[PDB]
Amino acid sequence: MGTYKLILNGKTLKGETTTEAVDAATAEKVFKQYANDNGVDGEWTYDDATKTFTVTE
C-alpha cells in the first residue's frame, strides 16, 4: 500500500511514528491501537505528501 506517518499531541504526551502496510486495512486497524496507547482522545488531520496523520488534544 504505502508508508503512513502518525504523530499524537496529548496535553502532557508526545510521539511521532511511520509505518508500512501491505494493504490499508491494517493501517486503519493499527491507527486506533497505535495512537490509543499514547493516551489520545482527539481529532485527526491529513497531509498526503508524507501520509502524515496528526492529532491535537
> Residue 43 is part of a domain; what is its CATH number?
3.10.20.10
Cα four-point dihedral sign 49, 31, 16, 54: positive
Residue with cell 495512537: 35
Chain centroid to Cα 3, Å, comes to 11
Minimal CA–CA distance to 4: which of 18, 25, 23, 16?
18
Helix (H) or strand (E) holding 9: strand 2-9
Measure the CA–CA gap between 42 and 26, rounded to whole angstroms.
21
> Solved how?
NMR
The total domain count for the chain is 1
Strand partners, 21: 2
Q: Which three cell numbers stand for residue 54?
A: 496528526
Residues in the chain: 57
Order across the sheet with 14-21: list the strands: 14-21, 2-9, 52-56, 43-47
Rg of the chain in Å (alpha carbons): 11
Q: Which three cell numbers stand for residue 42?
A: 482527539
Confirm if 4 and 19 have CB atoms less than 8 A apart: yes
